[PDB]
Design a binder for these strands. Structure first.
Ligand code: ADP
Ligand code: ADP
Ligand code: MG
Ligand code: MG
Lengths: 436, 436
RNA sequence: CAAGGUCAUUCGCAAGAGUGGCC
RNA sequence: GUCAUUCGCAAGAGUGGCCUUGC
């Protein structure tokens, strides 16, 4: 019985599962991703589903649901889970958390098969068996979330021998029991309803190899902690390091961290996701950047430090000489500068003898109370912009923009909206005109 | 013993196998390909290796060999073989053709395992068994090519339980026997040396499931046909439809077709690959295309048909009225024309009453003895260019080119070189400056 | 030497746009 | 309604170019 071999299709079933619902979304607004996965021997992230062998069944079902590339949380979660490592993932709503665990878990089940224990037991007959032993257990806080997880499981278990089931409180136990008795390899459950099934001898967790806690922060908020601990610690479920455990949550309070240390073994912490700073963006042609900078400098207080960012080292030297001949006390720093020359420049800047510092990205990585940060040249990527403006200690950041910075028009626009800053209407216009 | 699981690496092996040699070549000057695969229920081609699940070992070894995407012959051969169909593949030398069969075959062996027959026999001890039963046999005409096939097999069998071996004539039979005695699952062989090995009781073909005849045209020219027939038809090799047979050849003579019908079962025919047409390319700005066309028409003999291709239906109507108001008897045809209007236009064209036909791509698909085809607008792709100029019978083709046609500068340059035509120096110059 | 970003060409993919051809 | 090509944007990869940073 090979579980990696797809079973014959059903045109009827395909339409019910894939025609509508949660098909793929363009996760491009978010593609400028701050994502970090820290842990011992952390498996590297993926850029395509092909970078790991999901298997024939999963790749075909991904093609039916119309996903093309992994979401940023999936880029890390999928290789982490397929390497059989535990995962603590803090990801905001709409990141693709559900598929981030369903895809690797089901892929592993297809490759490994049901295991020796299930074969050694009486095969689930046409009249079923009273008690079922799920290979994988997913815990959810509500019926709504549990049903949504279950629906995605059907899409990814299409043409497989994995039969998903879902049980939730506030419903008829009779339907759920009768649905369980037809086989259950992946179970989605609210905690209270799952405890009832275990007490009734309908569900056994002796062979549960994949445990997922979805929306874990909410489950604690709703008072499900005793049920979860009864499910995991006070029963037959294999312990940490034998089972493969994953916790997903939108927030990371200390209550979730303490639960992670109790439930997860040698795990990876995965996190996905500047408002005390006034930010201005102005259109400036290249030949006008110097004159625009002079007006800002002529408007600066007597004892306010100004940090001016430029793209190239030659541009930094050229801008320093220009400002000096214009009569402005300034200094400069870049990568070619010796450590002594950097110290001399910073000494003048900190002392205030030269309250203007012309710097490349060398000062974006903090070498040291700057009041004004000026992007004389905007950086080529939005990550550099964040590091630059964070040098302020009220704090102001002014950036020069022209057609050369069109590569960050949307990324900069998203940042201004996200930081509750004010948005030039022409920036929105150029963004939509350039991308649609 | 799971054969889909990679075995531990070896830094030495990686360097010896992958550091140099024939790593990937960008099959980019040949992205524009005439490739047709014809046969009953022919599996669709692929565009990346991900489109079929090759397995962890294969995808890992592909990355080490620096292959990015399948070559045009690989796009069809890989899915055809992976679906267990026989293949008659005619492709020129240097097409990525060795890997076109090694990758799907080894992937199948990794997934299917060694089969029941091998598991029921004595394991190859460290004093290995005497007689070997290769799962896959590859036949080559010379030692040189056989070694070259074998070396690629080493790279793709890296970290696998598949052990390749190569035997060829004009060498010490002694080394080959004891290299075989250490185990052999995939065998590369020249026909003469293989016949000897069978007669020694060293090689058994009872379990060979994948038979490959590489450079089959040369093998027949070198007199290997009786040895091949003895190898395939007069021994224990499983017959067609049980074994999976592939034949590769740079040419497709009648002698190869007859051999394919004898050896291949329900096979697919795969083929990969205008000199009596003088072709001219001239730079013409858009505002000058009408004046340039007039000079050519005034230089046309009184009784010669000219076919003028344009991009849009509106362009066809506009060009017709312009020529008419200039005193040139002409007509036009495009997709929006009713069948009656098309017949009227063709009637005037073939009678010579209006020897100038202004047409869109609607006339690029055969509808006469046209003496001059003029690309007033060059098509957006080179395939359309071939179909347009093919309407001549001496026949001449003159094409207008400007910056709008930069998207086919390289493809048109390759075509003119391929068809032994004169090449404007500016066309090469613009091609290299645009792509490098 | 290593690490990062952007651009140009190419390949696939998704969304859009434009042209063409078939009914 | 179906089909083909091109172009814009976006993801990735390969090549090239360019810039930045660390010894
Ligand atoms: N690889 C992907 N590509 C495109 N869209 C995806 C992908 N993975 C998930 N999605 C979509 O993201 C949306 C959110 O799914 P969901 O799991 O509910 O996010 P979350 O659970 O973190 O709130 C769904 O519409 C889903 O189809
Ligand atoms: N998918 C690929 N991507 C890039 N290069 C490839 C690919 N496949 C093969 N090649 C290269 O193409 C060249 C031709 O290999 P070969 O099999 O001998 O062509 P052929 O057999 O048609 O004469 C080799 O250098 C090989 O490494
Ligand atoms: Mg060859
Ligand atoms: Mg092109």
């Amino acid at each position: 019985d090979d579980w990696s071999k797809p079973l014959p299709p059903s045109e009827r079933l395909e339409q019910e599962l894939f025609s509508g619902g949660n098909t793929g979304i363009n996760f491009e607004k978010y593609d400028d991703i701050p994502v970090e996965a820290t842990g011992n021997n952390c498996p590297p992230h993926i850029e395509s589903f092909s970078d790991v062998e999901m298997g024939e069944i999963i790749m075909g079902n991904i093609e039916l649901t119309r996903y093309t590339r992994p979401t940023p949380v999936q880029k890390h979660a999928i290789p982490i889970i397929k390497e059989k490592r535990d995962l603590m993932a803090c990801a905001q709503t709409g990141s693709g958390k559900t598929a981030a665990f369903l895809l690797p878990i089901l892929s592993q089940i297809y490759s490994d098969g049901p295991g020796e224990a299930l074969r050694a037991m009486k095969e689930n007959g046409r009249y079923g068996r009273r008690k079922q032993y799920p290979i994988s257990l997913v815990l959810a806080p509500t019926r709504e979330l549990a049903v949504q997880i279950y629906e995605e499981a059907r899409k990814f278990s299409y043409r497989s021998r994995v039969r998903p089931c879902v049980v939730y409180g506030g419903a008829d136990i009779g339907q759920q029991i009768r649905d369980l008795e037809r086989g259950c390899h992946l179970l989605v459950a609210t905690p209270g309803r799952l405890v009832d099934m275990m007490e009734r001898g309908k569900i056994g967790l002796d062979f549960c190899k994949y445990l997922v806690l979805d929306e874990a922060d909410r489950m604690l908020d709703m008072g499900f902690e005793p049920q979860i601990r009864r499910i995991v610690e006070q029963d037959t479920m294999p312990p940490k390091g034998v089972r493969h455990t994953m916790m997903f949550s939108a927030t990371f309070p200390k209550e979730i961290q303490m639960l992670a240390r109790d439930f997860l073994d040698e795990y990876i912490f995965l996190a996905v996701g500047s408002e005390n700073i006034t930010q201005k963006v102005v259109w400036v042609e290249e030949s006008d950047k110097r004159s625009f900078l002079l007006d800002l400098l002529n408007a600066t207080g007597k004892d306010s430090l100004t940090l001016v960012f430029v793209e190239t080292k030659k541009g930094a030297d050229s801008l320093e000489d220009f400002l000096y001949h214009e009569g402005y006390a300034c200094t400069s720093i870049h990568g070619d500068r010796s450590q002594r020359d950097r110290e001399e420049a910073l000494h003048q800047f900190r002392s205030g003898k030269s309250p203007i510092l012309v710097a490349t990205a060398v000062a974006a990585r903090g070498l040291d109370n700057v009041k004004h940060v000026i992007n004389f040249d905007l950086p080529s990527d939005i990550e550099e912009y964040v590091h630059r403006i964070g040098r302020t200690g009220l704090g102001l950041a002014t950036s020069f923009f022209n057609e050369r910075n069109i590569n960050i028009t949307k990324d900069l626009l998203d940042l201004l909206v996200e930081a509750k800053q004010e948005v030039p209407s022409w920036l929105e216009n150029m963004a939509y005109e350039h991308h649609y």
